[PDB]
Design a binder for these strands. Structure first.
Lengths: 166, 302, 246, 153, 48, 102
RNA sequence: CUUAAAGAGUCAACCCUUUGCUUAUCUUCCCUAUUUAAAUGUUAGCAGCCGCAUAGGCU
């Protein structure tokens, strides 16, 4: 049972709606919540989601938390009502790397003298970038790098961005 | 009878915003303006273009422009000037006998609400078309003819009613009807964060130089003057749906959504204006649209 | 309700250019109007009229002399006369890319007419020519001149043939007007008394002489009437035009 | 009338000139060289320019010189930088005597002695021979970091 | 050019009429004469 | 690679042989589009068919399609015709001629 | 049911020797480019390895 609530980004045409969702997710990423708690759901993953983001909050929904964490963005965000339903899904971030990323992966360990074992991997790998849902988000360690998303199954282990493995 | 608009008719701009400059200051200390610079940093590796088998592996060195506040400052400053220019009805190309009937048709126009919307777009911070996102409080200070006014927090779309906005409205509407001009200097203070992300106006790239470069003034981050002028004129709430404020425009067209709000349903500026010219009646809803579009100016002819 | 079937860009190779001893090059309209009777007898689809253009055409040979292959020795009575080359009588050949329009009535779905002309293209020969490549046929329906202009705009580019008519006689008209003659009919002269040397042994056979006419090569995007460009059987043992003389 | 494509975006790059945001006054610097012998024709002449000379001997060059340096003095030489101006101070350096013009009317030609002192000698040049070079500076309060309008191309 | 209407043309007050008249010998006032010298000091091409 | 002079049996050609022998034995049609590729050398000389002509300007004229090099169709059909190794004192295949004369 | 029926046009080639383009020359006069634009769409994987990396994770 999930008892889902929804969040909207009302009248963000001039600023970009999913940019405001990125700011919302970044602000809840680095302040308080989303450190292994129950999770969140983007219900409409088809061509740049936009408006509605559903957070279920299985261990109770707090009305004051929705205002104490979104007090800075009150001009664009309208707070929805709890809905007694268990139907929403949880999704996972996939990770794709560039050619130079695996170049540095094989320069970190497994043995390169100076350049010779680097040259054996100098041929291309074949890892390109596909385009389901690549949503921007701020990073305290990275530099505003955008999460590759994909639909997956229930796992009951969650992080500050997506699902886990166990 | 039934005269026609001239084929070459242009109106000079009555609203002149300077292209805003970005600085990094503190909430405790406003005065120490530290200039936010742009930075060309490399992003290489992004590929997979159409019909590419083995050539979609090239690492293109593209030193795209990023902009950040320095990590010792935590407040973004947006500094600009707005010059409201009077004698708001004269035509630099064309005239008379078509703008003179516009004088006798638009003499009874309510300039106060237009002026209050124009200064409330300042008061809300609308201009910052991104820098507002992720801000705890947007303090907007306007200094005009040696009386500085401040704005702590205001709604951006539903137009509120207060007296600090109306005080600037009462003397801007006097300008924007009579003559002369008024220049008001505007500074925006927002808490974005310690070393946060700051977004100036972007730019057209060349054939193959970069991917996204920003707009700079002597190596300092800045957004466009027409970017300020666009959010100055976000007044169009009078088309027959969708009560969100829209930039006033002869077709009611926004390009971020790709749908025009005054096109095809006879409410395009040109008609309203030309019918006004000949002699049909107007309400206060549509006449205010003509004069709000006529403040901006442009090309009305062909 | 008439129907049009179109053979576009057909590569004809080995087509003998000798339409007559005086006209060489394109085969006469008797050839392309007997193609209709060939599919009327071999296949069964009734063809009432025919029109033709030319995407490309070239007769095999040089600028003033086009000529003929070394002949074989495919005659009895030349037993010791085989080491020599040949007795060579002139038979120039050509090669061309053509467009063909056939007037047919079908009263059936159009998915059978295309295959039924396709398997006939592969077995017939275009005046001794060999079909190399030909576009897929498609069925056109026209009920007036406005929908006949839809047939007009789709043969672009080609050079269609329209009738022009003779003023007095052949070579005089070929000189003063600078036009092109070709054979449009045959005149019966004498009946062969014995039919033991015929290819049919039942139909009476008469000797013939070629009667000519003047024509015009016209851009297909500039013809007023397609019925001026169609050709059909006439009387007696002649061909003519639906639209008459241009 | 292009409604159909109103939506369609228009992306271009334009040039712009703007005062830097540390200063708030536009200076326009130029020179004006009134060259005398104003009736000779570079191509053609005489017998048509000579009768024009004897037809235009009694011209009123003082009024024309007054209008000609009043268009300097009124600051009409910019056409768009006057838009939103607190004060347009124009100073003229001619043969080491600097003159200053604070506020002059644009369309109605005023009657003063500061412009006329330039005019009385400029008409002497444009009636006779030689030349006079007068350097013009315009100082205008448009605003802090304001928008400026040079000649396009 | 901007208003697209000529002010001295259309009423035979184009320069080319009143310098030809002054050359041929008709009288001038002060208004028309100072137009001719005000345009002659501008310079240009007057011929065709 | 195939030996032109000697007819050597191989499995790749027998399927085409049967598929045209079925048409040859009964009734129908079969059409094959044939392409040849030759590494001759950089800028070598090719040999199209020559025309039978007493041309007054050109001595040896090669056959053309609007200027493009081309052979005669019956030049091709002569080589497909060239099968005869059944005449007396046979050493080379000759063209099918009713008197066996090339 | 086709001026239907059908045919190897093959070959060979030294074009080449030699050359004074010279002599001068006034483009030249005058001009209001202009008026207003949202850069949309970056909603695009990076310092990285926990990683046989081409399967799955964390700041």
């Amino acid at each position: 049972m999930y008892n889902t609530i929804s969040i909207t980004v009302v009248d963000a045409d001039d600023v970009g709606v999913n940019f405001v969702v990125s700011k919302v997710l970044s602000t809840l990423h680095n302040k308080g919540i989303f450190n292994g708690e129950v999770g969140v759901t983007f219900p409409r993953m088809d061509k740049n989601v936009g408006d509605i983001i559903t957070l279920f909050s299985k261990t109770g929904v707090d009305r004051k938390v929705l205002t104490s964490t979104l007090n800075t963005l009150t001009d664009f965000i309208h707070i929805g009502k709890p809905k007694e339903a268990d139907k929403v899904k949880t999704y996972r971030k996939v990770d794709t790397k560039s050619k130079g990323k695996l170049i540095r992966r094989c320069i970190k360990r497994k043995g390169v003298s100076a350049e010779t074992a680097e040259s054996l991997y100098g041929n291309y790998k074949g890892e390109k970038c596909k385009l389901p849902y690549i949503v921007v988000n701020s990073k305290s360690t990275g530099q505003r790098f955008s999460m590759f998303l994909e639909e997956c199954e229930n796992s009951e282990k969650f992080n500050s961005y997506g699902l886990c493995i166990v | 009878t039934k005269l026609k608009a001239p084929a070459v008719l242009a109106y000079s701009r009555k609203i002149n915003p300077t292209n805003a400059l970005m600085f990094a200051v503190n909430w405790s200390d406003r005065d120490n303006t530290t200039a936010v610079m742009v930075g060309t940093k490399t992003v290489a590796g992004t590929q997979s273009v159409r019909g590419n088998p083995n050539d979609a592996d090239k690492g293109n060195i593209q030193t795209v422009n990023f902009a950040n506040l320095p990590h010792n400052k935590n407040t973004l400053l947006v500094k600009y000037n707005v010059k409201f220019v009077g004698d708001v009805f004269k035509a630099e190309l064309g005239g008379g006998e078509y703008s003179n009937t516009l004088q006798t048709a638009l003499e009874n126009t309510d300039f106060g609400t237009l002026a209050y919307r124009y200064v409330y777009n300042i008061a809300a911070g609308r201009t910052l078309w991104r820098n507002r996102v992720g801000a705890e409080s947007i303090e907007t200070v306007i200094t005009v003819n040696d009386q500085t006014f401040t704005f702590s927090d205001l709604l951006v779309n539903e137009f509120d009613e207060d007296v600090d906005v109306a005080e600037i409205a009462d003397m801007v509407a006097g300008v924007l009807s009579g003559e002369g001009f008024v220049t008001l200097k505007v500074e925006h203070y927002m808490l974005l964060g310690e070393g946060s992300e700051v977004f100036p106006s972007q730019e057209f790239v060349e054939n193959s130089k970069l991917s996204k470069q920003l707009f700079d003034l002597n190596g300092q981050a800045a957004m466009h003057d027409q970017k300020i002028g666009n959010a100055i004129r976000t007044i169009d709430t009078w088309y027959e749906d969708a009560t969100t404020p829209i930039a006033v425009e002869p077709y009611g067209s926004v390009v971020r959504n790709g749908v025009a709000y005054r096109a095809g349903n006879k409410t395009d500026l040109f008609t309203l204006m030309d019918g006004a010219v000949n002699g049909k009646s107007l309400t206060e809803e549509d006449q205010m649209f003509v004069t709000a579009n006529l403040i901006r100016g442009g090309v009305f002819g062909g | 309700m008439r129907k049009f079937i179109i053979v576009k860009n057909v590569k004809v190779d080995g087509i003998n250019a000798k339409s007559s001893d005086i006209t060489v090059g394109m085969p006469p309209a008797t050839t392309f109007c007997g193609l209709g009777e060939t599919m009327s007898i071999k296949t069964g689809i009734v063809v009432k009229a025919v029109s033709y253009g030319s995407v490309k055409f070239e007769v095999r040979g040089s600028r003033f002399n086009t000529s003929v292959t070394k002949f074989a020795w495919q005659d009895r009575g030349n037993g010791g006369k085989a080491n020599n080359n040949s007795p060579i009588q002139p038979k120039p050949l050509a090669d061309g890319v053509f467009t063909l329009c056939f007037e047919v009535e079908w009263e059936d779905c159009a998915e059978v007419l295309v295959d039924k002309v396709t398997n006939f293209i592969n077995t017939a020969r275009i005046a001794g020519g060999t079909i190399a490549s030909f576009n897929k046929p498609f069925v056109k329906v026209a009920k007036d001149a406005e929908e006949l202009a839809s047939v007009k705009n789709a043969m672009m580019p080609c050079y269609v043939v329209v009738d022009c008519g003779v003023e007095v006689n052949i070579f005089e008209d070929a000189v003063n007007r600078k036009l092109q003659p070709m054979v449009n009919g045959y005149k019966k002269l004498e009946k062969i008394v014995d039919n033991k040397h015929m290819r049919d042994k039942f139909t009476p056979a008469y000797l013939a002489t070629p009667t000519y006419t003047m024509i015009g090569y016209k851009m297909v995007s500039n013809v007023d009437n397609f019925d001026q460009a169609l050709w059909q059987y006439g009387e007696n043992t002649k061909v003519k035009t639906i639209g008459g003389i241009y």
